[PDB]
Ligand binder design. Structure first.
Ligand code: CLA
Ligand code: CLA
Ligand code: CLA
Ligand code: CLA
Ligand code: CLA
Ligand code: CLA
Ligand code: CLA
Ligand SMILES: CCCCCCCCCCCCCCCC(=O)OC[C@H](COP(=O)(O)OC[C@@H](O)CO)OC(=O)CCCCCCCCCCCCCCC
Ligand SMILES: CC1=C(/C=C/C(C)=C/C=C/C(C)=C/C=C/C=C(C)/C=C/C=C(C)/C=C/C2=C(C)CCCC2(C)C)C(C)(C)CCC1
Ligand SMILES: CC1=C(C/C=C(\C)CCC[C@H](C)CCC[C@H](C)CCCC(C)C)C(=O)c2ccccc2C1=O
Ligand SMILES: CC1=C(C/C=C(\C)CCC[C@H](C)CCC[C@H](C)CCCC(C)C)C(=O)c2ccccc2C1=O
Ligand code: SF4
Ligand code: SF4
Ligand code: SF4
Lengths: 41, 64, 73, 219, 162, 740, 80
């Protein structure tokens, strides 16, 4: 189990954790909140 | 005996070396009167791939 | 149009030649012992700082101009 | 004009970076400290220490010529399109179609090239045919420069050796012989000839398009 | 009404463009049944277009001679009028960018104080990265406190050839 | 002697080796001191020969990798079937193949993106596909989506089985070298079992299930009232009603009265007038014949029962007077080296892909495929590119074999030794042929350009002025047309309508019209021959000089993939065999681009279009013969006259093609940065940036180096090929979809 | 031909003489290193310039340098 969790810290932790998190965050923000061109001030 | 203590970290002062102003560990110091007897070893490799080099007594300074 | 294009291309080639001859000067006739500690030898001490800041400005302009153009596109 | 002015600033700072770096790091670097003892225009310092391809200041200037050509091409494209839309009373075309690159490629490179390529068609020819001919002549010179830029000397050296064997062991043509041994161009020479072909094509193609597109629909 | 522009609320080109898009989208409504999935998708797109035009307008955003909204970027010129929101709020990017930089710099310094810091780069220390990610919320305070102490830079320990 | 040598449990199944990323090579086990270690880890991940010298271990590794590839292909195939089952409009297209456009991809409405969901017709909106999957699903009977759903699920099950087979054969039951070296047994089972039984099973499927497409779907019967495929298999009366020979019931097959099966085993030379494709009965009779041919072909070699042949004996019994020994150690070469077999297999595989590209547009085999110009042009272009890439790979692996697995002891006076002996004569002759073809095939274009520019149109190589006609191809076309009257009496008509005189049209649009040849066809054919000769020159030179050249006599010991040999002898950059492949890749791109351009313009100007009562009108103005003789004609009437759809594509349904067009241009322009510059410049620039990071103490623990000399060339050629191919792709798709 | 030079920072590992493919460098005795031998280059006219000696040099910076110069029939690697 230690080898699997240490395998999960090379390339997935940076290319599928952060990428999926950041992409999903920006996409869900643009999905619930439609297209933002100003600070709505 | 003439060079620094074996195992002590030193600083290189050769202005044309890849480890200029760096810190390297002295592995051995020769006592035969050669031109460059202080042999040092560095953690980071150079452009060629080696990690050790030998310097003279004047181009070796103590760390900080 | 022909006059403007002609004069601008000529200016670009001459501007490249100026820096080329500056590099030729630094290699062929720059003796460091003559002008010790002056501005010419002083700008050479932080050449890494000068080159690095030029790299930052170029990366900023490239990233943002390309990004604004692709976003509008 | 905001984005185009920023593009001009980008080209200026990048060309200045290449030239200033090649000028300051001309007499030595950490990869090659004795560069000042090698002159100004040398091929490299072998494939050792990782490889030292294009390490001289001549090579740095060589790389900066492309950026200079790109920057001057951007400033002249901007000038020609703004004046091309001002001279025909359609100043609102560039102001609303110059923000996106597809608009640049459509309303500038594709729309203003309708009369240039129509210099000679199967229905005859006109005054613009000479410009149409040199418009393609520049493309051919540019493509020949890409050859000297991509392909390097060793491949060509072996090829020239095979041609030497062919001329020596052939009948009725072995009577003649070269006074000087044929050899491939050098590394520095190949960069210079490729740059010359690249610059000549870049200049001839744009001069043909500019004079033809302006002369073709205006006075 | 600055730099020769006009509010998006009183521009004919803005309304002309709005009606153009609402018409080109409405032209596709006749090709489908009034109660199916393509009809529902086209109706959702139409509602989003109307909302965007209303949202883009009446919010101080102004366009110029073509109905397209322009953005004021000079501070002072964007502060004297209600245009600070369009681009003067650069602090959002500066905050996220400094957050990323502080987290990476804290991970590089802490990992270097260990025997062979290399394999710690190709194989991340996830409990140390997650702890350092949630600890950098107040990054400008740490940056100003790490600058006055001189722990942000080096004096003269650099591989230079100058 | 042929047995099953297996070695059970040779490698454990744990994640211990997954922890250390660099473990296959003894050089990457030390860890990553410099950033070049990451690129070395990726570039050496599949070079099994560099992992060890154990041929048995190398063979086991490639045998498990094959199963992994099969699992990947099966997952992709199942995905296409599932997409056509759920996110498509196959049922709507099945009732109107001449008016509804295919679509099998729907996009979610996130940032804009609703515009891409184009109205394809039939109460559905999505991305229009050009893969031909709908035509393929039409050819073998498939009515509802439940069958596509079942095909997707069955393929996923088979994909999981293939992945399990790979793990099993590498960790639980690994074979041995004595098992892998049974080439006679492998050839016997691949010819008799794989190809032969595959054709026989497909013939059976076309004889029983492809029945709606050949008798009920083309007759105008609604797809819902068509009986299910199992009803035709079980009920004999329902199949006897369609074909009366089925009432005989295996009696004419076994009583040798095959003439009774003449209704569903026809030999009709032509296309179906209702669909546009070949006759299903003809394709079925075709598969039946192929199965018999391969089944009788798979009994040539001897394995364990005495009768048969020996490949070693057949090779050693071929010695002539002009080749010395000849085929002496070819068996030892082809049975102990994987690169030799890979080079032969890749060459024949790429050439086969090109054959597939030609025969598919020539004789369209799927219903309603010839009237779908988008899928037609797409399939031709795709198969051509795949074939060219494979031939360049063959030229690469031949040099890899010549550098690593070439022992100059088992080859004393054979064909390989004689070929390497007169390499200078071979390369010099190929060089001359290349130059001659270039002058005589490009100077004609430049000559027509100058003659048209100077106002002298009567002095150019054209049909009106001084012409050049391809009389040999005109005679072959005539021979194939009048061939079913004398040299093919049992054939109803010609095997294709390319050389015929009867234009077929389905839905008002032309399906397959006769093709004429003129001077421009002669000019473009010589252009194709010239580019093919330059590509073969670069590749063959690399293979023949990869061992040791007269300039660098120790090129074998230097390796296969090396930067150069220093700046000596004036300069020796890119003298390695790998560099020749890099140069070759460039020429293959330049050749295939002209090939696909010739195809697209010739089809759009001479075959495709629409037929009316007052003649047939092509897509373009029929300007292939009067505008292809000049270079300006191409740039003006092809790239500039076309691509206007790609240019004006903003805001429409095919708006992604304009973005892909501009995006592809950027990637190609980005390749030049990696291709013209060197490495010392980037290394010194990276040094300055390292100083900036050291000033703030953000120096990366793994020192950041520049790319390698071969890495920069590899990155540049990859970006160049990607940009150019994606540019032509976006242009072709947008033009043919918005026009055809 | 090319000019090859050997500096005093040599350690006498005899790797450049092994890497030279034209027999240009040699090892002469010396009294300034632990190995008591320093490289030399008597057959400089046979130098071709492939710079394999510089890649074989392990000390930093390189003790042997190959400065390219005029080209002859031998230094150009011509076989015709
Ligand atoms: C269209 C071709 C192209 C492009 C895009 C570039 C781009 C660049 N060049 Mg370059 N160059 C080119 C052609 C090109 N060059 C040619 C033909 C030559 C002559 C050989 C040169 C010679 C040259 C030199 C000598 C130098 C440069 C430098 C630079 C960099 C300048 C920094 C900058 O402007 O910010 C960035 C600008 C960009 C356009 C960034 C592109 C990346 C964007 C953001 C896309 C990101 C990808 C996206 C996230 C998806 C990734 C996933 C994908 C991998 C699947 C920049 C990345 C200078 C440099 O190094 O700067 C420090 C420099 O020294 N160039
Ligand atoms: C392969 C390319 C090619 C070819 C085949 C031709 C062919 C021709 N051009 Mg031409 N041209 C070309 C390229 C080419 N051109 C290019 C690139 C340009 C632009 C620079 C021009 C510009 C041009 C102009 C301006 C004109 C022509 C003209 C002509 C025609 C007569 C020219 C002439 O002097 O006769 C040929 C003279 C020869 C000496 C030919 C020699 C034949 C050799 C020896 C082959 C025969 C022997 C062979 C080796 C067999 C071996 C035998 C064995 C025993 C060894 C002719 C049909 C003229 C014309 O009016 O057209 C009608 C003309 O005015 N061309
Ligand atoms: C670098 C160039 C660049 C820039 C400047 C922009 C900028 C923008 N793009 Mg664009 N884009 C670009 C490149 C660029 N893009 C490229 C290259 C492409 C092609 C791939 C696209 C394709 C694209 C599309 C398709 C779209 C955009 C959209 C947008 C707008 C989105 C605003 C947003 O994201 O909501 C807000 C995002 C957030 C709030 C992120 C949250 C981050 C954290 C959680 C909050 C930050 C902390 C907070 C501020 C508190 C700090 C406290 C502080 C006060 C102290 C924005 C103005 C969208 C749009 O609406 O157009 C107008 C959209 O449709 N872009
Ligand atoms: C978090 C690490 C980090 C930090 C603090 C910096 C900081 C800096 N970089 Mg830099 N850089 C980094 C990573 C980093 N870089 C990486 C990974 C690369 C390779 C792609 C570069 C390549 C680079 C170049 C070419 C240049 C700089 C420059 C600079 C300076 C100008 C500001 C800037 O934003 O430039 C721009 C920074 C980038 C374009 C890099 C963005 C890529 C992301 C942010 C890096 C990913 C870091 C990672 C997530 C951290 C791991 C987190 C950890 C918890 C696991 C600045 C001090 C410029 C300079 O010379 O100084 C004036 C300059 O020209 N950097
Ligand atoms: C008549 C029996 C038979 C059949 C049908 C096959 C079929 C196949 N062999 Mg095989 N082979 C056989 C006998 C047979 N072989 C024998 C006796 C030997 C020993 C000399 C070999 C040694 C051998 C080697 C060394 C290799 C193959 C490979 C292949 C595959 C080629 C993939 C392809 O090109 O596309 C066709 C793809 C398909 C038709 C998809 C079908 C997938 C199913 C699951 C295949 C099942 C057939 C299987 C042989 C059934 C028996 C196994 C059973 C215990 C389950 C293919 C599926 C290559 C491979 O391994 O690829 C993975 C390969 O490297 N064979
Ligand atoms: C290669 C593929 C193939 C297949 C699978 C079939 C299959 C079939 N064909 Mg056929 N056919 C083919 C090709 C094929 N054909 C070709 C190429 C031609 C020439 C063009 C023909 C021409 C043809 C004609 C003219 C006819 C058929 C017919 C038939 C059907 C009955 C034949 C029969 O009864 O034989 C014998 C069947 C067996 C001996 C049974 C196999 C033994 C079973 C499976 C053993 C299982 C027992 C197991 C040990 C225990 C059971 C398990 C239990 C306990 C759970 C049958 C479904 C007839 C038809 O139309 O049907 C309505 C018929 O009239 N075919
Ligand atoms: C448009 C650019 C261009 C051009 C014109 C060429 C031309 C040529 N390449 Mg090339 N190449 C290029 C780009 C180009 N390349 C690029 C970008 C790459 C990188 C991948 C390469 C890589 C490459 C390789 C690896 C090789 C070539 C080779 C060749 C030659 C093969 C000769 C031949 O068979 O055809 C005919 C030649 C021509 C048509 C040249 C044009 C001559 C015209 C007709 C002018 C006619 C003469 C004129 C009338 C006289 C002018 C008068 C004046 C003096 C006053 C040829 C001369 C091969 C070679 O060396 O030859 C064996 C070789 O192996 N190229
Ligand atoms: C259409 C294809 C291209 C057309 C022109 C091809 C010529 C260019 C290359 C010729 C090089 C000559 C050196 C031969 C090298 C050589 O002599 O090999 C030796 C061979 C006889 O060798 P042996 O009998 O000793 O070989 C026996 C054992 O080696 C068996 O393995 O002689 C021939 O090849 C006769 C064929 C001459 C050339 C025929 C062309 C072959 C191309 C395909 C067939 C074309 C037929 C006409 C179709 C239109
Ligand atoms: C009064 C006036 C004004 C002002 C102005 C000014 C303030 C001025 C200026 C200006 C300037 C500011 C200019 C400039 C330019 C510059 C340049 C262009 C540069 C250069 C340099 C170089 C190129 C270098 C070379 C070299 C090298 C590399 C190194 C050393 C050596 C030598 C020197 C050779 C205004 C507008 C406000 C307004 C109007 C009036
Ligand atoms: C083709 C090619 C050659 C071979 C090129 C040769 C031998 C050029 C000579 C061919 C003829 C003689 C050129 C024709 C000369 C010009 C038309 C006029 C030149 C005269 C001016 C000086 C006035 C190289 O030597 C080479 C070297 C390094 C990188 C790439 C390459 C390369 O691509
Ligand atoms: C630019 C260049 C380099 C420098 C190349 C470098 C520095 C490689 C750059 C790799 C980058 C860092 C990979 C990651 C790319 C982006 C970070 C991806 C963007 C992802 C964002 C969303 C974060 C060479 O080393 C070289 C060598 C030989 C011939 C030509 C060249 C050459 O042209
Ligand atoms: S320029 Fe040529 S010889 Fe010099 S390092 Fe690069 S590839 Fe090697
Ligand atoms: S450059 Fe080559 S030939 Fe000259 S001394 Fe060094 S290894 Fe020998
Ligand atoms: S390789 Fe360098 S250190 Fe070794 S003997 Fe030669 S010159 Fe001296």
């Amino acid at each position: 189990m230690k080898d699997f969790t240490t395998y999960l810290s090379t390339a997935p932790v940076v290319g599928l954790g952060w990428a999926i998190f950041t992409s999903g965050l920006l996409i869900e923000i643009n999905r619930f909140f439609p297209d933002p061109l100003v600070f709505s001030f | 005996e003439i060079g620094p203590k074996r195992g002590s970290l030193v600083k290189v002062l050769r202005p044309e070396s890849y480890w200029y102003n760096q810190v390297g560990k002295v592995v051995s110091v020769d006592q035969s009167g050669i031109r460059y007897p202080v042999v040092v070893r560095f953690e980071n490799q150079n452009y060629a791939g080696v990690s050790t080099n030998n310097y003279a007594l004047d181009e070796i300074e103590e760390v900080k | 149009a022909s006059l403007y294009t002609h004069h601008q291309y000529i200016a670009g080639f001459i501007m490249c030649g100026a820096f080329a001859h500056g590099a030729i000067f630094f290699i062929r006739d720059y003796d460091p012992e003559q002008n010790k500690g002056n501005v010419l030898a002083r700008v050479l001490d932080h050449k890494e700082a000068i080159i690095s800041h030029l790299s930052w400005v170029s990366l900023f302009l490239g990233f943002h101009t390309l990004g604004l153009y692709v976003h509008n596109d | 004009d905001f984005l185009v002015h920023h593009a001009i600033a980008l080209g200026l700072h990048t060309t200045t970076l290449i030239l200033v770096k090649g000028a300051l790091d001309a007499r030595g670097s950490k990869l090659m400290p004795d560069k000042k003892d090698f002159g100004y225009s040398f091929p490299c310092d072998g494939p050792g220490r990782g490889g030292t391809c294009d390490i001289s200041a001549y090579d740095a200037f060589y790389l900066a010529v492309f950026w200079m050509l790109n920057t001057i091409g951007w400033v002249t494209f901007y000038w020609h399109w703004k004046h091309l839309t001002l001279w025909q009373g359609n100043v609102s075309q560039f102001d609303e179609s110059s923000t996106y690159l597809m608009g640049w490629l459509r309303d500038y490179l594709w729309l203003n090239s309708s009369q240039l390529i129509n210099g000679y068609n199967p229905f005859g020819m006109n005054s613009l045919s000479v410009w149409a001919w040199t418009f393609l002549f520049g493309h051919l010179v540019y493509a020949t420069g890409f050859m000297f830029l991509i392909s390097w000397r060793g491949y060509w050296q072996e090829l020239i050796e095979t041609l030497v064997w062919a001329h020596e062991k052939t009948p009725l043509a072995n009577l003649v012989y070269w006074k000087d041994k044929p050899v491939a161009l050098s590394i520095v020479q190949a960069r210079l000839v490729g740059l010359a072909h690249f610059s000549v094509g870049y200049i001839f193609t744009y001069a043909a398009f500019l004079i033809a597109s302006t002369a073709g629909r205006f006075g | 009404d600055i730099a020769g522009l006009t509010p998006c609320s009183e521009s004919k080109a803005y309304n002309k463009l709005e009606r153009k898009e609402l018409k080109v989208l409405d032209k596709r409504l006749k090709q489908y049944e009034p109660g199916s999935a393509p009809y529902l998708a086209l109706q959702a797109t139409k509602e989003r277009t109307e909302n965007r035009f209303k949202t883009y307008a009446k919010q101080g955003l102004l366009c110029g001679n073509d109905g397209l909204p322009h953005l004021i970027s000079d501070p002072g010129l964007a502060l004297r009028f209600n245009h600070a929101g369009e681009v003067f709020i650069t602090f959002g990017f500066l905050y996220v960018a400094g957050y990323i930089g502080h987290v990476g710099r804290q991970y590089i310094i802490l990992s270097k104080e260990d025997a062979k810091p290399t394999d710690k780069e190709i194989i991340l220390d996830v409990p140390l990265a997650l702890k350092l990610a949630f600890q950098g919320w107040a990054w400008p305070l740490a940056s100003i406190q790490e600058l006055r102490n001189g722990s942000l830079l080096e004096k003269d320990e650099n591989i230079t050839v100058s | 002697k042929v047995k099953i040598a297996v070695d059970r449990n040779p490698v454990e199944t744990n994640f211990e080796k997954w922890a250390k990323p660099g473990h296959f090579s003894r050089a990457l086990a030390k860890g990553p001191n410099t950033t070049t270690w990451i690129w070395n880890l990726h570039a050496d991940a599949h070079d099994f020969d560099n992992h060890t010298s154990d041929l048995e271990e190398i063979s086991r590794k490639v045998f498990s990798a094959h199963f992994g590839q099969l699992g990947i292909i099966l997952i992709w195939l199942s995905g296409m079937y599932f997409h056509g089952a759920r996110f498509s409009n196959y049922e709507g297209w099945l009732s109107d193949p001449t008016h509804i456009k295919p679509s099998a991809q729907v996009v979610w409405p996130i940032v804009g993106q609703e515009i891409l969901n184009g109205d394809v017709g039939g109460g559905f909106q999505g991305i229009q596909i050009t893969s031909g999957f709908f035509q393929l699903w039409r050819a073998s009977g498939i009515t509802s989506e439940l069958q596509l759903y079942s095909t997707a699920i069955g393929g996923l099950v088979l994909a999981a089985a293939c992945f399990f087979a790979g793990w099993f054969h590498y960790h639980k039951a690994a074979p041995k070298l004595e098992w892998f070296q049974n080439v006679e047994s492998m050839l016997n089972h691949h010819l008799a079992g794989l190809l032969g039984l595959g054709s026989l099973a497909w013939a059976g499927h076309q004889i029983h299930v492809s029945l709606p497409v050949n008798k009920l779907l083309d007759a105008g019967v609604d797809p819902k009232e068509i009986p299910l495929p199992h009803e035709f298999l079980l009920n004999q009366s329902i199949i006897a009603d369609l074909y009366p020979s089925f009432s005989k019931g295996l009696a004419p097959f076994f009583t040798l009265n095959w003439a009774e099966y003449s209704d569903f085993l026809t030999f009709k030379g032509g296309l179906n007038p209702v669909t546009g494709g070949l006759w299903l009965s003809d394709t079925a009779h075709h598969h039946l014949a192929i199965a018999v041919l391969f089944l009788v072909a798979g009994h040539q070699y001897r394995t364990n029962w005495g009768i048969g042949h020996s490949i070693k004996d057949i090779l050693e019994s071929h010695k002539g007077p002009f080749t010395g020994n000849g085929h002496a150690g070819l068996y030892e070469i082809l049975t102990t080296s994987w690169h030799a077999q890979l080079a032969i297999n890749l060459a024949l595989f790429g050439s086969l892909s090109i054959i597939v590209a030609h025969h598919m547009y020539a004789m369209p085999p799927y219903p309603y495929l010839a009237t779908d110009y988008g899928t037609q042009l797409s399939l031709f272009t795709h198969h051509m590119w795949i074939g060219g890439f494979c031939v360049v790979g063959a030229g690469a692996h031949a040099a890899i074999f010549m550098v690593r697995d070439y022992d100059p002891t088992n080859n004393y006076n054979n064909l390989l030794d004689r070929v390497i002996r007169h390499r200078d004569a071979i390369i010099s002759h190929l060089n001359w042929v290349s130059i001659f073809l270039g002058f005589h095939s490009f100077g004609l274009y430049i000559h027509n350009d100058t003659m048209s520019a100077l106002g002298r149109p009567q002095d150019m190589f054209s049909d009106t002025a001084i012409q050049l006609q391809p009389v040999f191809a005109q005679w072959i076309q005539n021979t194939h047309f009048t061939a079913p009257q004398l040299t093919a009496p049992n054939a109803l008509a010609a095997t294709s309508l390319t050389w015929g005189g009867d234009v077929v049209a389905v839905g008002g649009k032309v399906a397959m019209m006769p093709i004429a040849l003129g001077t421009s066809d002669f000019l473009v054919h010589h252009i194709h021959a010239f580019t093919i000769h330059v590509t073969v020159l670069i590749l063959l030179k690399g293979v023949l000089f990869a061992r040791s050249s007269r300039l660098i006599p120790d090129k074998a010991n230097l390796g296969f993939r090396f930067p150069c040999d220093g700046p000596g002898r004036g300069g020796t950059c890119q003298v390695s065999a790998w560099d020749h492949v890099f140069l070759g890749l460039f020429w293959m791109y330049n050749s295939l681009s002209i090939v696909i351009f010739h195809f697209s313009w010739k089809m759009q100007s001479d075959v495709w279009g629409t037929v009316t009562d007052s003649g047939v009108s092509h897509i373009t103005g029929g300007n292939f013969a009067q505008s292809a003789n000049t270079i300006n004609g191409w740039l003006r009437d092809f790239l500039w006259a076309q691509s206007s759809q790609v240019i004006q594509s903003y805001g429409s349904a095919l708006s992604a093609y304009g973005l892909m067009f501009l995006g592809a241009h950027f990637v190609w322009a980005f390749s030049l940065m990696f291709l013209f510059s060197g490495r010392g410049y980037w290394q010194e620039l990276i040094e300055s940036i390292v100083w900036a990071h050291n000033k703030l103490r953000v120096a990366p623990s793994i020192q950041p180096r520049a790319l390698s000399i071969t890495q920069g060339r590899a990155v540049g050629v990859a970006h160049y090929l990607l940009g150019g191919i994606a540019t032509t792709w976006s242009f072709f798709l947008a033009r043919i979809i918005a026009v055809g | 031909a090319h000019v090859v030079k050997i500096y005093d920072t040599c350690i006498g590992c005899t790797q450049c003489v092994r890497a030279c493919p034209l027999d240009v460098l040699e090892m002469v005795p010396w009294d300034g290193c632990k190995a008591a031998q320093m490289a030399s280059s008597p057959r400089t006219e046979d130098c071709v310039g492939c710079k394999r000696c510089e890649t074989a040099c392990p000390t930093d910076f390189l003790s042997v340098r190959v400065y390219l110069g005029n080209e002859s029939t031998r230094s150009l690697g011509l076989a015709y």
